[PDB]
Design a protein around this ligand. Structure first.
Ligand SMILES: CCCCCCCC/C=C/CCCCCCCC(=O)O[C@@H](COC(=O)CCCCCCCCCCCCCCC)COP(=O)([O-])OCC[N+](C)(C)C
Ligand SMILES: CCCCCCCC/C=C/CCCCCCCC(=O)O[C@@H](COC(=O)CCCCCCCCCCCCCCC)COP(=O)([O-])OCC[N+](C)(C)C
Ligand SMILES: CCCCCCCC/C=C/CCCCCCCC(=O)O[C@@H](COC(=O)CCCCCCCCCCCCCCC)COP(=O)([O-])OCC[N+](C)(C)C
Ligand SMILES: CCCCCCCC/C=C\CCCCCCCC(=O)O[C@@H](COC(=O)CCCCCCCCCCCCCCC)COP(=O)([O-])OCC[N+](C)(C)C
Ligand SMILES: CCCCCCCC/C=C\CCCCCCCC(=O)O[C@@H](COC(=O)CCCCCCCCCCCCCCC)COP(=O)([O-])OCC[N+](C)(C)C
Ligand SMILES: CCCCCCCC/C=C\CCCCCCCC(=O)O[C@@H](COC(=O)CCCCCCCCCCCCCCC)COP(=O)([O-])OCC[N+](C)(C)C
Ligand SMILES: CCCCCCCC/C=C\CCCCCCCC(=O)O[C@@H](COC(=O)CCCCCCCCCCCCCCC)COP(=O)([O-])OCC[N+](C)(C)C
Ligand SMILES: CCCCCCCC/C=C\CCCCCCCC(=O)O[C@@H](COC(=O)CCCCCCCCCCCCCCC)COP(=O)([O-])OCC[N+](C)(C)C
Ligand SMILES: CCCCCCCC/C=C\CCCCCCCC(=O)O[C@@H](COC(=O)CCCCCCCCCCCCCCC)COP(=O)([O-])OCC[N+](C)(C)C
Ligand SMILES: CCCCCCCC/C=C\CCCCCCCC(=O)O[C@@H](COC(=O)CCCCCCCCCCCCCCC)COP(=O)([O-])OCC[N+](C)(C)C
Ligand SMILES: CCCCCCCC/C=C\CCCCCCCC(=O)O[C@@H](COC(=O)CCCCCCCCCCCCCCC)COP(=O)([O-])OCC[N+](C)(C)C
Ligand SMILES: Oc1ccc2c3c1O[C@H]1c4oc5ccccc5c4C[C@@]4(O)[C@@H](C2)N(CC2CC2)CC[C@]314
Ligand SMILES: Oc1ccc2c3c1O[C@H]1c4oc5ccccc5c4C[C@@]4(O)[C@@H](C2)N(CC2CC2)CC[C@]314
Lengths: 1107, 123, 170
């Protein structure tokens, strides 16, 4: 029937009508007054039942003929004579808008609803979250009027208890008594926190007004909140979210829900608070201004398994304050103080007039409520006692119901409340079991509870003894937390597609993910021989560096707040940040290349740039402390990250601000020098020493101690271990310096162009000249070296070597230049000569003309040599970026060109056959007009000074007007638009070009450590040796053990200085000092007004003691 | 004048993509040499006989809840940005330190009304 | 992989991105023909290339009439005022009208049969073609303005002309 409520829930009607006690009121003609006023013992009168069965019985006189044997008059029970029926009510009970819209729900169910059915209602149907706290408020109806001061504290404490725990608040529902003060607390401090606060009012379907207006199946009914003057009944409170309405008889009969509300508390406390915690949901009882039936409710909570605790307030003044006074004058669980019962029972009867007879009956309840003091928490207002009742609500669930501190701690873990756990669980004197704090850590890591991981580490948990292999197997294999939906896609990409449905993840599989993300020759510690054998066997079952293992975990599970926390703890801070920058970057690249409805690539790319910024800020901190030791931090092997290097990790991430940072640029500048001391040399001297080999020995070099921060080769280190440096060592130092390899290739390249310019300008005979064979020998041997750069570069995959190398500009240009040369040399050399006149062989012409065009590639390649300079380099990279940026302005200039050329050719040349010359003529002249050529005497072809007098004809007077418009658009609009484009894009392209230039000095300078000594006409001598030693049989930074110790102390010290100066800059800013002033002046305003009230309590005794 | 004309031109370009893209929902499939085939059909079906966003009833409900929630988040973050600015924190400090200066001087007068009884009760 | 065969044709040809390129390619082929017509010698009767041009501009003009009548606002004269407010819609009106002024002088003229361009009515018809074709190249900026980068520059050229008027007057 498209209604889950109708198949399960229940209305119920009083179908069998028993009249009232004896008496109809007045009005002698008795036959009419038995219908007009006589109520049913149901409670409603006889004309409102309508009783489809007994409607045929009311016509006789009524149901059930007369006197009915007085024992049988009482016989109406709601079980026997009150018949059940389907729904009649559910929908939205939207209150008339005050501050906001304020929707809510209702059900109208029976009394005999089973406890499993009512639990099934709240969770599944109404889409509510299973809570972590139930605050059942209880007090007295209709009494009223807290003070203004106490209204703020009890109001604020009830909210911050519920929004920080995600609690249900069970109220009476109706606006009398408690719920008026519960909702006014919601009026003050809402902050739209009804998403987290779910106040559930359990009222009856009785004393509520406008019950017949709520009649309806799936009806969004409006409901008014106007205080009805003539009436005395109660309305619902506007700031509730859900209503449960129970009817036993009818309007009046003010109790049916006391059992059902209490049975609801039993069902929640039997449900698990979380899918990892065996403890059940706690229930607390808050007591405002109370009553006579309240005392039976408080005692019914304490006498139960489990013993639900009770929180009692004071200051309101009723039975609430009786429980405050009775609990106060009482020590631990003995009978009484001195005999002051005439003072107690007198105080009981001033609340409600009992009169010494059953006021004694209240005292047996007051002596059982002073008995269980441990489960009673009184909140004394006026001495800031126990600090904001939300502490005292949550503390009351820890003092009584004796359980382990583990049970106290894991309860706070579900609430996500550390200030209760720090100040009331980790107190002095608390004794802990051996494995309890470890089980708390395992729960807190899965549940993404960062501030508890911080608390458990400070209170004794060691991650070294904690983080085992099977436990870290679990941390990946949880769905009981915020998981990454991307990790399972990464695992199937490295296991070739096999996916069983259960599939507990192994660490052999995670390592294959890390090696896939880090790329290159990265080898994780999971996929090596030592780990696989001890993984088969299952101390050695622990990890040496646990916080390296969890930092990867937090990144792969996309738990950034956990990752930032686990980064600060442990060693190798700048390295872990660069690894994390790479791991998120690779997952961001996999996210785009994957068919998911949730991209989450911009989230990972932001996370990659956060750790990248941390790496730069640690390098800046290390560079300010000591320049030389910071350059060592860039190049020492890490021994926990696949023997990699902080440069190699940042270059792998393409993290430009690290490579462009002034520390790496000093290191790159010093690797360029080699063992030459180019601070006290000159570039004149390096070039001179290439041409004059004996001039090498007059050059100042660097000592072994001036090179401890520079990585070297293995055999280059052997040269340094031994004015030092005898003769044959100084030749190795010179010719293997990258600066020398450069000029020794540059001078050979300039001599190459001088020859290849000579070849192409001078007449070519049949056989090549001596100059031309030197050219061929260069480009051939130059091509071999380019083949060697491809094969022997970085990445094991041969096709991946290809994709990197064709990504640079001049490497693609070299490929076209090398191929087209031998196409040209082939046509040139391998052609049948004529012997009568050259250039009657069109194959030889085509070969020569390729030389004339191929030489452009080799002059533009001088920009490639010019880009080594600090000033010229950024401009060369700038030219390319400006061409790409101005493309669409130039396209517009090309359409304006064709808009003019086509009509000019059409008007001036009306008698043309189809020819490809027409394509030339519509483009040619209008293009040269952009560049200054007006063609002054071809304008106005019918003039006397015209150089085209035969073109004069019909309508050629239009073309001067066309060309006037053309050049206005080209120079005056489009050329000046293009000047303006470059001006206003200059600074941000010059800036980008500086960083790109500085980034790519790494790949440039680290290439010259691997290039041979000898330039590309003579390099073939070096390729023979390279094949000789390979068939027959990069740089590292060496450190002794006392220099690794001094370096690790430097890395640790500079990280400590980083977080201290970061905290000192935040605490000393103007923004933070104003607000801490703001928060203290707020508290001082509270105290002085409250001390100002105490000193007014002093002057009452001044008038007394003056008397 | 480049930056402020380039800026105006970006907004004008972005504004007029609406009239551009919503025009191509109504244009025929077929281009203007062959479009005459489409104008015969357009006269055939008219004499003889824009886009909407369809939502089911459970998606209109999810959309109205989204509209209400985002407006609630708008006024809350507008009030939190105002109450957390440096301009507003200084003046609420200014107004409270003013009232505290009033009270302490006036409590400072009461405690001077105390020392009249100190000389009395010391006697 | 849902959407059987005859559904995937409806999805393609009714996408606005496809309607664009399917009009753009036809427009570029139009200019290639109409550039050929105007550069090559014109005889008395139009060539096959020239009739395709006329068939385009005629059927292109019908679609512009349809855009006016079937657009938004119930008032017919309000449909007019909105449409002549854009740049290239005014330029299309001059381009369409001046083409058939030129085709009229071109086609409906008494030929000479001894030498072309002794008929000054035929010359005037041809010279209108040579000037009308400027409208249709500048209209490529209208097609170029769909791009995110080129578009703002095309709208920029017009705003800069208006702003520099008084410097150019000086
Ligand atoms: C990492 C990436 C960068 C590296 C790229 C490196 C690879 C670069 C690849 C280069 C290869 C390019 C193609 C070669 C020329 C063939 C085409 C051609 O037009 O041939 C002509 C010459 O035909 C001959 O038989 C004579 C050729 C003599 C040898 C020179 C070409 C090969 C050298 C390559 C050395 C390169 C090795 C470099 C070291 C590895 C055919 O025409 P014809 O015979 O002239 O005319 C016949 C008619 N007639 C006789 C009537 C006139
Ligand atoms: C990469 C970025 C894209 C660039 C854009 C596209 C580039 C433009 C592309 C244009 C296409 C090329 C046009 C020529 C067509 C073939 C010529 C031919 O067949 O014969 C001609 C040979 O003449 C030549 O070969 C020289 C051609 C003119 C030089 C063009 C310079 C570029 C200027 C524009 C640059 C800006 C263009 C602006 C765009 C609107 C001669 O005719 P013939 O019948 O062989 O002999 C006649 C005999 N007679 C000479 C004795 C009288
Ligand atoms: C929403 C807004 C945008 C849409 C706008 C759309 C409307 C565009 C409106 C266009 C109309 C423009 C005017 C038409 C030409 C008349 C002027 C002229 O010079 O005529 C000449 C041709 O006279 C003839 O009689 C021959 C014309 C043949 C038909 C071509 C013109 C009409 C086509 C229109 C198709 C357009 C319909 C498009 C679809 C609706 C008269 O001179 P002559 O006779 O050559 O010379 C006599 C002397 N002799 C013989 C000695 C040489
Ligand atoms: C690949 C890299 C090599 C490295 C470079 C060093 C090794 C290269 C060095 C020398 C090789 C020269 C070839 C040997 C034959 C000598 C004859 C000769 O040249 O005679 C000519 C004199 O010309 C000259 O003296 C120079 C000619 C080339 C111009 C550039 C010279 C400087 C290049 C290198 C130094 C600059 C270094 C700049 C940077 C510091 C006279 O002309 P011809 O020859 O009678 O007539 C030509 C007609 N034919 C072609 C049709 C036949
Ligand atoms: C991956 C690289 C691929 C390379 C492919 C290799 C291409 C090889 C291509 C062609 C081979 C040419 C050999 C001859 C072929 C038959 C014609 C013939 O014999 O002679 C004719 C030659 O006519 C010409 O046009 C010759 C030049 C053609 C090459 C054009 C440049 C291509 C390279 C672009 C630049 C490189 C860019 C590459 C960069 C990537 C005429 O001459 P003849 O007959 O001797 O006699 C004179 C006339 N007679 C007959 C009237 C008397
Ligand atoms: C046999 C005779 C042998 C000698 C003759 C040949 C002379 C040598 C060859 C050429 C001229 C160079 C001489 C000056 C070098 C200055 C040093 C310098 O600072 O270099 C910079 C650029 O280094 C370069 O190499 C820039 C490019 C020059 C070589 C290639 C020719 C392109 C430019 C010209 C083409 C034609 C131009 C158009 C006019 C025709 C690099 O250094 P830096 O960043 O400034 O920082 C200084 C510290 N550092 C050096 C440690 C890095
Ligand atoms: C038909 C008539 C034509 C009409 C005119 C129109 C045609 C002429 C038009 C353009 C010609 C200019 C060519 C250069 C354009 C490069 C653009 C580029 O992407 O550069 C790239 C590098 O490239 C450079 O840094 C270029 C360095 C070499 C200079 C170019 C040669 C010009 C000089 C010799 C000429 C001598 C003249 C005589 C010889 C004939 C940079 O790309 P990017 O955008 O930064 O991308 C981001 C970085 N990324 C690359 C790492 C991913
Ligand atoms: C309009 C703006 C204000 C200007 C006001 C003043 C001007 C009034 C406007 C226009 C004047 C048009 C006629 C002038 C020609 C007279 C001289 C003549 O005969 O010239 C030629 C023919 O010329 C023609 O046959 C005219 C061709 C038609 C032009 C179409 C409009 C052009 C302007 C665009 C539309 C306008 C809007 C443009 C947007 C601003 C010569 O040919 P011929 O006769 O054979 O000569 C003998 C040659 N023989 C010896 C070689 C054999
Ligand atoms: C409206 C929109 C249509 C859509 C376009 C497709 C349909 C249009 C397709 C074809 C129609 C061609 C007409 C049919 C007759 C063929 C004869 C012919 O052309 O011969 C010529 C060869 O010329 C060519 O082959 C092409 C000539 C036009 C230049 C542009 C071609 C590409 C245009 C379309 C494709 C580019 C698409 C680019 C974008 C992707 C030889 O010259 P002639 O003719 O002997 O002499 C002329 C003298 N007369 C004029 C005085 C007589
Ligand atoms: C039979 C053979 C058929 C093919 C041949 C014909 C090829 C096709 C025809 C023309 C060339 C276009 C090819 C490149 C298209 C790139 C796609 C693109 O991004 O387009 C952009 C511009 O889209 C346009 O249409 C811009 C204008 C080009 C078409 C009109 C010619 C004017 C410019 C040239 C005139 C001459 C120039 C002067 C030199 C002579 C729109 O996209 P976007 O904003 O960048 O964003 C991308 C996302 N989006 C696509 C979902 C929107
Ligand atoms: C006698 C000799 C003359 C001397 C020289 C001086 C005369 C020449 C001078 C000026 C000529 C240039 C004409 C364009 C001016 C447009 C101004 C404008 O208002 O643009 C509007 C759109 O317009 C555009 O966006 C223009 C796009 C098309 C390009 C113009 C054609 C030029 C190229 C072809 C030429 C090829 C050459 C060969 C053919 C012959 C924008 O207006 P707006 O200000 O932004 O208004 C606000 C927005 N609003 C519009 C929505 C309200
Ligand atoms: O930052 C770099 C600093 C210096 C150099 C490079 C850098 O990056 C490269 C790159 O990228 C460019 C992009 C656009 C324009 C120019 C370039 C260049 C140029 C270059 O090709 C070049 C010099 N050498 C070889 C040449 C022998 C010296 C190789 C490396 C190179
Ligand atoms: O924002 C827009 C984005 C793209 C386009 C437009 C926009 O606005 C229009 C407008 O306005 C301009 C003012 C000044 C200069 C150029 C234009 C343009 C150009 C244009 O004409 C054009 C493309 N198409 C038709 C052409 C088939 C594509 C129609 C709509 C159009």
């Amino acid at each position: 029937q498209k209604s889950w409520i109708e198949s399960t829930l229940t209305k119920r009607e009083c179908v069998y009508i028993i009249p009232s006690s004896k008496d109809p009121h007045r009005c002698l003609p008795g036959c009419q007054i038995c219908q007009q006023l006589v109520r049913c013992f149901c409670g409603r009168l006889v004309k409102q039942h309508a009783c489809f069965t007994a409607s045929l019985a009311m016509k006789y006189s009524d149901v059930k003929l007369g006197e009915h044997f007085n024992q049988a008059i009482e016989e109406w029970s709601v079980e026997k004579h009150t018949e059940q029926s389907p729904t009649d009510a559910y929908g939205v009970i939207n209150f008339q808008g005050g501050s906001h819209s304020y929707r809510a729900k209702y059900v109208r169910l029976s009394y005999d609803t089973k406890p499993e059915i009512i639990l099934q209602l709240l969770l599944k149907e109404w889409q509510m979250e299973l809570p972590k706290l139930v605050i059942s408020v209880h007090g007295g109806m209709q009494k009223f009027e807290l003070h203004p001061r106490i209204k703020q504290l009890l109001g604020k404490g009830l909210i911050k208890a519920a929004v920080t725990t995600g609690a249900w608040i069970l109220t009476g529902g109706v606006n009398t008594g408690v719920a008026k003060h519960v909702g006014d607390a919601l009026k003050e401090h809402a902050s739209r926190s009804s998403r987290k606060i779910c106040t559930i009012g359990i009222a009856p379907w009785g004393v509520i007004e406008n019950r017949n207006d709520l009649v309806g199946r799936d009806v969004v009914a409006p409901y008014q909140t106007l205080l009805n003057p003539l009436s005395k009944l109660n309305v619902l409170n506007n700031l509730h979210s859900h209503f449960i309405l129970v009817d036993d008889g009818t309007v009046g009969k003010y109790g049916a829900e006391v059992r059902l509300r209490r049975e609801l508390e039993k069902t929640i406390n039997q449900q698990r608070i979380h899918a990892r915690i065996g403890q059940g949901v706690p229930v607390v009882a808050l007591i405002f201004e109370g009553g006579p039936n309240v005392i039976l409710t408080v005692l019914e909570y304490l006498q139960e398994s489990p013993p639900v605790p009770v929180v009692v307030c004071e200051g309101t003044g009723r039975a609430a304050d009786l429980l405050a006074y009775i609990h106060k004058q009482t020590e631990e669980g003995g009978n009484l103080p001195d005999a002051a019962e005439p003072d107690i029972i007198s105080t009981i009867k001033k609340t409600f007039n009992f009169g010494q007879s059953e006021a004694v009956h209240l005292f047996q309840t007051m002596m059982e409520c002073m008995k269980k003091k441990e489960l009673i928490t009184v909140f004394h207002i006026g001495s800031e006692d126990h600090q904001d009742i939300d502490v005292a609500i949550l503390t009351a669930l820890l003092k009584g119901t004796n359980a382990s501190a583990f049970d106290q701690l894991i309860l706070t873990l579900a609430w996500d409340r550390v200030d209760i756990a720090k100040n009331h669980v980790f107190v002095y004197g608390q004794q802990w079991l051996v494995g309890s704090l470890e089980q708390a850590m395992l729960d807190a890591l899965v549940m993404d509870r960062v501030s508890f991981v911080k608390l458990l580490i400070e209170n004794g948990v060691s991650m070294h003894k904690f983080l085992t292999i099977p436990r870290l197997e679990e941390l990946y294999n949880t769905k009981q937390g915020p998981t990454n939906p991307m990790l399972f896609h990464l695992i199937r990409d490295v296991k070739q597609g096999n996916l069983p449905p259960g599939y507990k993840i192994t660490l052999i599989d995670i390592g294959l993910v890390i090696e896939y993300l880090m790329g290159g020759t990265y080898r994780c510690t999971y996929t090596r021989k030592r780990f696989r054998l001890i993984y088969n066997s299952l101390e050695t079952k622990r990890f040496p560096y646990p916080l390296n293992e969890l930092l990867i975990w937090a990144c792969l599970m996309k738990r950034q707040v956990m990752a930032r926390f686990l980064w600060q703890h442990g060693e190798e801070s700048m390295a872990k940040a660069l690894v994390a920058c790479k791991i998120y970057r690779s997952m961001a690249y996999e996210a785009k290349q994957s068919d998911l409805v949730d991209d989450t690539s911009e989230e990972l790319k932001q996370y990659s740039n956060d750790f990248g910024q941390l790496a730069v800020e640690l390098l800046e901190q290390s560079f300010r402390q000591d320049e030389t030791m910071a350059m060592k931090l860039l190049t020492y092997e890490l021994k926990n990250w696949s023997n990699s290097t902080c440069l190699k990790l940042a270059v792998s991430s393409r993290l430009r601000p690290f490579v462009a940072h002034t520390c790496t640029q000093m290191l790159l500048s010093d690797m360029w020098m080699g063992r030459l001391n180019m601070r006290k040399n000159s570039w004149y001297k390096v070039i001179l020493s290439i041409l004059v080999p004996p001039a090498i020995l007059m050059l100042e070099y660097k000592t072994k101690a001036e090179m401890s921060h520079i990585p070297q080769s293995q055999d280059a280190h052997q040269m340094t271990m031994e004015k030092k440096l005898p003769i044959t060592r100084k030749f190795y130092a010179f010719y293997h310096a990258p600066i020398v390899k450069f000029w020794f290739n540059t001078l050979a390249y300039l001599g190459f162009l001088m020859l290849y310019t000579f070849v192409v300008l001078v007449k070519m005979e049949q056989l090549p000249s001596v100059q031309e064979w030197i050219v061929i020998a260069y480009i051939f041997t130059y091509a071999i070296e380019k083949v060697r750069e491809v094969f022997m570069s970085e990445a094991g995959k041969i096709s991946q070597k290809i994709k990197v190398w064709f990504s640079d500009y001049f490497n693609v240009s070299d490929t076209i230049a090398i191929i087209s040369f031998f196409v040209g040399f082939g046509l040139r050399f391998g052609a049948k000569w004529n012997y009568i006149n050259a250039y009657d062989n069109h194959v030889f012409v085509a070969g020569r003309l390729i030389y004339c065009l191929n030489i452009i590639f080799w002059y533009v390649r001088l920009l490639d040599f010019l880009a080594v300079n600090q000033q010229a380099g950024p401009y060369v990279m700038m030219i390319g970026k400006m061409v790409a940026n101005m493309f669409y302005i130039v396209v517009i200039m090309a359409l304006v060109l064709l808009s003019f050329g086509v009509p000019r050719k059409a008007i001036l040349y009306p008698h043309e056959e189809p020819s490809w010359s027409l394509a030339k003529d519509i483009v040619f002249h209008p293009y040269w007009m952009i560049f200054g050529e007006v063609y002054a005497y071809e304008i106005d072809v019918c003039a006397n000074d015209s150089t085209l007098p035969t073109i004069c004809g019909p309508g050629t007077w239009l073309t001067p007007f066309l060309q006037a418009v053309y050049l206005f658009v080209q120079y005056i609009i489009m050329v000046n638009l293009l000047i303006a484009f470059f001006n206003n894009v200059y600074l941000q392209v010059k800036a980008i070009s500086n960083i790109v230039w500085k980034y790519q000095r790494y790949h440039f300078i680290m290439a010259y450590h691997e290039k041979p000594v000898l330039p590309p006409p003579l390099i073939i001598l070096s390729h023979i040796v390279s094949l000789f030693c390979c068939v027959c049989k990069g740089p590292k930074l060496f450190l002794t053990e006392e220099d690794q110790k001094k370096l690790h102390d430097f890395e640790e010290q500079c990280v400590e200085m980083y977080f201290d100066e970061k905290d000192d800059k935040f605490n000393s800013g103007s923004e933070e000092r104003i607000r801490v002033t703001f928060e203290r002046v707020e508290q001082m305003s509270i105290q002085i007004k409250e001390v100002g009230d105490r000193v007014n309590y002093i002057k009452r005794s001044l008038q007394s003691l003056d008397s």
